[PDB]
Amino acid sequence: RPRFSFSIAAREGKARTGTIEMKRGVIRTPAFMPVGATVKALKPETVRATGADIILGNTYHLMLRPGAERIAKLGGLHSFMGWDRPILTDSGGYQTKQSEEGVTFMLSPERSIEIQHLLGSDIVMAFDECTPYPATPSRAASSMERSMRWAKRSRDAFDSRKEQAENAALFGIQQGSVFENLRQQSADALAEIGFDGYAVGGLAVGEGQDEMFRVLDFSVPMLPDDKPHYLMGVGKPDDIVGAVERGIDMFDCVLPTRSGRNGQAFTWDGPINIRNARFSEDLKPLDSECHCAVCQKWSRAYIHHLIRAGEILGAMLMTEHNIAFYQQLMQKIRDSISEGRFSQFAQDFRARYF
Amino acid sequence: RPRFSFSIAAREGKARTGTIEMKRGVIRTPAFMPVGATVKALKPETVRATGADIILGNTYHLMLRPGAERIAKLGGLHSFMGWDRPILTDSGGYQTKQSEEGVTFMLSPERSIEIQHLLGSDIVMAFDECTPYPATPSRAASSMERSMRWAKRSRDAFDSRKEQAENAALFGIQQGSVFENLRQQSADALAEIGFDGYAVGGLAVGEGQDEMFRVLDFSVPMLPDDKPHYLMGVGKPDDIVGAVERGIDMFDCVLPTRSGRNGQAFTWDGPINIRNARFSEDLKPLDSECHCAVCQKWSRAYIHHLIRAGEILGAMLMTEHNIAFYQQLMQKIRDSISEGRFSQFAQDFRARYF
Ligand SMILES: Nc1nc2c(CCNCC3CCCC3)c3[nH]c(NCCc4ccccc4)nc3cc2c(=O)[nH]1
Ligand SMILES: Nc1nc2c(CCNCC3CCCC3)c3[nH]c(NCCc4ccccc4)nc3cc2c(=O)[nH]1
Ligand SMILES: [Zn+2]
Ligand SMILES: [Zn+2]
Known about the structure:
The structure is a homodimer of 354-residue chains. Chain A is an alpha/beta fold. Chain A has a single domain, classed as TIM Barrel, CATH 3.20.20.105. Helices cover 44% and strands 17% of the residues of chain A. Chain A has 15 helices and 15 strands. Chain A has helices at 44-49, 59-64, 68-73, 77-81, 109-119, 137-159, 162-167, 180-193, 209-219, 237-244, 255-262, 293-297, 300-308, 312-338, 342-353, and strands at 5-12, 15-22, 25-29, 31-33, 55-58, 87-90, 97-98, 103-104, 123-125, 169-174, 197-200, 229-231, 250-252, 264-265, 272-273. The first copy, chain A, has an eight-stranded parallel sheet with strand order 4-13-12-11-10-9-6-5. Chain A has a three-stranded antiparallel sheet with strand order 1-2-3. Chain A has a two-stranded antiparallel ribbon with strand order 7-8. In chain A, β7 (97-98) and β8 form a beta hairpin. In chain A, α5 (109-119) packs across α6, α11 packs antiparallel against α14 and α13 crosses α14 (312-338). The radius of gyration of chain A is 20 Å and the shape is globular. Chain A starts with a strand and ends with a helix. Chain A binds chain B through residues 37-38, 40-43, 65-66, 70, 73-75, 80-82, 280-281, 283, 297-299, 301-302, 305-306, 308-309, 311-313, 315-316, and chain B through 37-38, 40-43, 65-66, 70, 73-75, 80-82, 280-281, 283, 297-299, 301-302, 305-306, 308-309, 311-313, 315-316. The complex binds the ligand Nc1nc2c(CCNCC3CCCC3)c3[nH]c(NCCc4ccccc4)nc3cc2c(=O)[nH]1 (2 copies) and zinc ion (2 copies). One ligand 0O1 is lined by residues 35, 56, 58, 90-91, 93-95, 125, 128, 130, 173, 201-202, 204-205, 232-233, 252-255, 258 of chain A.
């Protein structure tokens, strides 16, 4: 496989399905990336069995513990955690004294790219500022412009590290809050620098689905069509469907994992809270259709018991199911786009989910 | 398979190796029984892969949540938790207003046997009193005598339930504290009633290994030779070896599970606490020889990181390793007895473990 190759196999409206080929493996798009140096309560083999092709790691948390340098000493993140497929790392740009140099908590564009190198990241995110919401036009602009200067510094840091440049990919992050002209300026800046892929940053920061969707409507077309489009931090199953309808190819969210531990299970009929007393003697699986190993073997009643009891196995089972659900959603999306029936799938999904 | 058949295949001194055959499966002895309606942080398939043939459940905890009747409604403990092999249940006699009728917390011999039935237990423990340590001779005697009266009531309750009597086994529990004459009286009483197996109760209650061993020296020979001998709540790897040298066939302990979650890993060179800084960059597996999946795939360094971070996967990995260690210990014991070299194994084990 090449360092990076994105190929679109089929389209329906703005939606696309295809593959990203990288040295450590192939990524099917639209893709959901479970978030980790562990995907909480799952062994990597379990993550893989659910259908994930790539997972996310984090510059900020890993740099604190166990340390970037320590992980490199030990062989890199892949060997450390036992996941041999691609890993995307965020830059630390979401998760203090700020300056043009970077942020003291030190993290700058250069340090962020170095940490991702030390971790052995396959997909490296530029170091950005995730603009708070709401933001005035002035502040959104100032923040966006800084991020574009940091995007150039990120590019140059990545490129000056031969091993990194030859084996990893670099994504740029569009900012601009909810303002069309700032999103356009940002897209233009990023395309001028040139990246392997383009994220839509600064959303899922409290604006609400309708606003998020309105911003995606004009922002995604601004990005290079022939490169992947990554919506950072999204989201609920319905957010995902609507975002793919607007041209997004990649997603990460802590919801399936976090939710899972707190008792929320995703189903095709909508989310359920398994701790509710109504499930205490319910012998059916979490979801009627789900092909995951949890739904093949255990009942709602048992998982209800486990979560109310605080048992670790409850977290394990809920998290495996939810990540499997998300991957099954992505597979249905991929298949429906490839077959030219995604708009019908989206409508069907929504009518049942809601 | 029959309801219950114990066969001794080989002996060395007081040590024995063989099999217990029951309807849900075969149990290799000497046996270690992991303790659970979950073996903490492990799926049942994982428990089975470590080599366990039987696991333990608990009358007391299950009767509180989710309830005995509720579990029966749902199909019994085996279907509920997804473990289809034998299950031994304790009576609640270790774990309030006491009277000859039973104990109010209500639990009596009759209720205890009924709860174990409702759970679908394969090996049912008589309802007893675990005599506090230290105990004077008077109190130990009074307590032992009550337990023997409760043993008869347990026998009669079990026998009056046809389904239970035809499909499950019943073990009696010897008491008498540390006093030889009370242990003999108790053994005699239990043999007169007649059970499928005989536990040594009232040990591992703070007396210390030397005293425990001295009591086993005279107490185990008092029990029927042709029936299994179960030492309740023991213990550390070295307790297990010494107890098998004294005629014990079955063991349960929460140590491998509890220890695992708290950072203590068992190794052939003795226990280690994985949180110690010395393991932070140690790429070796938990144990050099261990065949478990954890030692095949992850380093001390990674598990160190996980446990210090409070990650669930750390508990999962530590617990799988420790239960695998215990099963490998049992296999080495079984093999060494069958080959007539257990005394040498015991000495070798101790010299390296300590
Ligand atoms: N560099 C960068 N990162 C962003 C992130 C983090 C994406 N997940 C990273 C993982 C790395 C490890 C942790 C996260 C975002 N996450 C969200 N929404 C999350 C909202 C949410 C919160 C809790 C639950 C569900 C959703 N918006 C984000 C915007 C940006 C952004 O502009 N720039
Ligand atoms: N009916 C009965 N049960 C006893 C138990 C419980 C055995 N494990 C049951 C499982 C069912 C679910 C929970 C336990 C005992 N456990 C111990 N020692 C444990 C000491 C220990 C404590 C903590 C960690 C390691 C060892 N002595 C015991 C004596 C008796 C006894 O006479 N009668
Ligand atoms: Zn499922
Ligand atoms: Zn191991």
